[PDB]
């Protein structure tokens, strides 16, 4: 009915978000699925975050994203307070004010990758491919997993994505095999903060034609 998951606290932290599902009848998990509906963040007095991926995949869905101060605050008054009012509006890499999780909570209807295909190519660590894939779908994007297996005619865009710092020959082939734009994932985590497609440009990868 309403489930939650947290990003950033403590072992003390987690006591209080506990206690306070415990009174409000709140459900909690440890991993984040479809269902989760909050996500609850650590964060500044000006409800900056660090970027975690529960962030991510919490803004992907549209759910709700509060800062942790809304726990302490409806403990501090015996009343579960206004979600709206303790949102996140940035984190430490894409800036302070950028005010994201609130748009994608109500931008479900035009999803920024609606009608694309994105490949997640080759190595992922930093996160679980499939962690990224499901990211982008949540998004509108669909998921490709060969470079081989992107669709024709246009209309739809496809794009890859690649984490070259984790290779060890040419990962700037891959013009090569394939007619689409090589970005890092940089690019998707940007679009997902802010929830709007980003300038490839800044993420472009030279590809060895
Ligand atoms: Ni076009």
């Known amino acids: 009915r309403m489930s939650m998951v947290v990003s950033g606290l403590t072992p003390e932290e987690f006591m209080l978000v506990y206690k306070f599902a415990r009174k409000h009848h709140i459900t909690l998990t440890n991993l984040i699925t479809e269902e989760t509906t909050h996500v609850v963040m650590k964060t500044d007095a000006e409800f900056v975050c660090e970027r975690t991926l529960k962030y991510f995949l919490g803004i992907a869905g549209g759910k709700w994203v509060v800062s942790y101060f809304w726990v302490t605050q409806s403990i501090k008054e015996r009343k579960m307070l206004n979600e709206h009012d303790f949102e996140v509006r940035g984190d430490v890499v894409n800036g302070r004010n950028h005010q994201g999780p609130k748009r994608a909570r109500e931008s479900q209807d035009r999803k920024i990758f609606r009608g694309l295909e994105i490949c997640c190519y080759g190595p992922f660590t930093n996160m679980p491919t499939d962690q990224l894939e499901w990211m982008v779908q949540l ?66 990868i030279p590809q060895i034609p």
């Open 139 to 204: 998004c509108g994007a669909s998921v490709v997993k060969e470079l081989s297996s992107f669709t024709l005619g246009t209309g739809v865009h496809p794009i890859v994505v690649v984490q070259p710092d984790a290779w060890t020959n040419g990962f700037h082939a891959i013009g090569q095999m394939c007619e689409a734009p090589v970005v890092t994932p940089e690019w998707v985590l940007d679009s997902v903060a802010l929830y709007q497609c980003q300038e490839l440009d800044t993420y472009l």
